[PDB]
Design a protein around this nucleic acid. Structure first.
Ligand SMILES: Nc1ncnc2c1ncn2[C@H]1C[C@H](O)[C@@H](COP(=O)(O)OP(=O)(O)OP(=O)(O)O)O1
Ligand SMILES: [Ca+2]
Ligand SMILES: [Mn+2]
Length: 430
DNA sequence: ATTATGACGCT
DNA sequence: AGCGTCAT
């Protein structure tokens, strides 16, 4: 009852850019705007692999991981933009730099956790407390929430989608009790007002649109964000969780999309997140371990405590290339040349990072993959990163991996390498 | 031949 | 440390 924690202590948002790499390319090239289009890497094998898709193109069934040649079968007029190639490899710098544009704007509003190249969590608890004082108990107008969906509403006693959005919003606002500065629902609402302002700022200052989720924790915020894309935001209240979760496949919740989620389903014989409430905490811990069990017990009730970490910059800087099928590296000279290509991009990114962010990487991690193994990584080895020098880093990488070569011959490399990966880690202030 | 990343957990 | 999982 009264001692039952409800996980309503925080206001957390997740802001995620809409079809991000596509928008970056559409900003640059106006001919691509408001068109079915996709971003592709490489071109020679099956037209290239699609890694981002505009919403116009998704309507034709175009998806990520599709070969462009196959996408063109669904959508003959599909427009394509190619990822830059430098030193023989796809180079994602344009998109990393566009990400920084967005992250710096968001950081003006609150502390953010960079979660990916195109999304960040926002801890709005303090900003909300501030805005609530300035509101001085004055009600929140629907005009302050022009792109907000309230999940689960409208309910009870309608043709248009925007009409539905407004009906739900008005039911929500009509019910709000604004005299209580500590009502979690009010706090979420003010959170949503701030996220409208954040999202407006992002679009004004970059040209990019995004979606957002507002809830009491990261997992609900992430789930919320996806419920109404593109270019909209969704508030998931604590009260909305039982209905929302009652038909929510377990795999949809962040961290349950893989083997653990499959095991929850198989072992417990359930399908939906809400069905988890019928197990004791000890029961869940018995099957999934202490940490996962406790996490699942709270999460299926809408409760999660993972903090928004104050981190705007990536913790690692890495360079990787696959060498599929018959392109697999089979000579020593080949392996060395590509290590150098990777090391040269890494040096360039590292040197910029040091100037921009007052830090230096101290460890170089080298990963490779061998033909036959379809684990992502066959082997990882670390060495000291003492100088930002591509020739040294590539020589050092070769040194830590050269032992994997089972070839009795000096020049030959066996089994051939199907992946190389250089990652700079363990930053220190400088 | 679903590529190029990036964070975090386990032992 | 080196491996695995999950994610975008
Ligand atoms: N599996 C991947 N491989 C390579 N790049 C990826 C992959 N997934 C995502 N990206 C890149 C391209 C995306 O534009 C960007 C952001 O990913 P993501 O948020 O999942 O989709 P998206 O922004 O393209 O569309 P959406 O509107 O659905 O969010 O990261
Ligand atoms: Ca996105
Ligand atoms: Mn994303």
């Amino acid at each position: 009852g009264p001692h039952m924690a409800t996980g309503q202590d925080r206001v957390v948002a997740l802001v995620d850019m809409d079809c991000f790499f596509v928008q970056v390319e559409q900003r640059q090239n106006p001919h691509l705007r408001n068109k079915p289009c996709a971003v592709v890497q490489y071109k020679s094998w099956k037209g290239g692999g699609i890694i981002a898709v505009s919403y116009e193109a998704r309507a034709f069934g175009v998806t990520r991981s599709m070969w462009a040649d196959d996408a063109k079968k669904l959508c003959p007029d599909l427009l394509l933009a190619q990822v830059r190639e430098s030193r023989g490899k796809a180079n994602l710098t344009k998109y990393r730099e566009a990400s920084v544009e967005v992250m710096e704007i968001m950081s003006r509003f609150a502390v953010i956790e960079r979660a990916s190249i195109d999304e960040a969590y926002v801890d709005l608890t303090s900003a909300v407390q501030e805005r609530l004082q300035k509101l001085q108990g004055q009600p929140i107008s629907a005009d302050l929430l022009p792109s907000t969906y309230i999940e689960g509403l409208p309910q009870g006693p309608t043709v248009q989608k925007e009409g539905m959005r407004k009906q739900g919003l008005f039911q929500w606002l009509d019910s709000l009790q604004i005299d209580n500065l500590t009502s979690p629902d009010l706090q979420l609402t003010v959170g949503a007002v701030i996220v409208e302002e954040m999202r407006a700022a992002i679009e004004r200052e970059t040209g990019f649109q995004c979606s957002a989720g507002i809830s009491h924790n990261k997992v609900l915020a992430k789930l919320a964000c996806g419920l109404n894309k593109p270019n909209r935001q969704t508030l998931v209240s604590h009260g909305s969780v039982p209905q929302l979760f009652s038909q929510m496949p377990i795999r949809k919740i962040r961290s349950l999309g893989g083997k653990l989620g499959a095991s929850v389903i198989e072992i417990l014989g359930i399908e939906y997140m809400g069905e988890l409430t019928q197990f004791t905490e000890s029961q869940l811990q018995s099957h999934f371990g202490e940490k996962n069990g406790s996490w699942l017990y709270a999460m299926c009730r809408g409760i999660e405590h993972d903090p928004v970490k104050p981190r705007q910059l990536p913790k690692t800087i890495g360079c990787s290339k696959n060498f599929p099928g018959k392109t697999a590296l089979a000579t020593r000279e080949q392996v060395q040349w590509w290590l150098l290509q990777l090391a040269q991009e890494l040096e360039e990114r590292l040197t910029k990072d040091r100037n921009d962010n007052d830090r230096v990487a101290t460890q170089l991690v080298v990963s490779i993959r061998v033909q036959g193994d379809k684990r992502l990584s066959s082997l990882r080895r670390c060495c000291a990163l003492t100088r930002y020098d591509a020739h040294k880093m590539s020589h050092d990488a070769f040194t830590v991996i050269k032992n994997c070569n089972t070839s009795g011959i000096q020049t030959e490399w066996s089994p051939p390498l199907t992946m190389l990966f250089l990652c700079a880690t363990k930053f220190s202030a400088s």
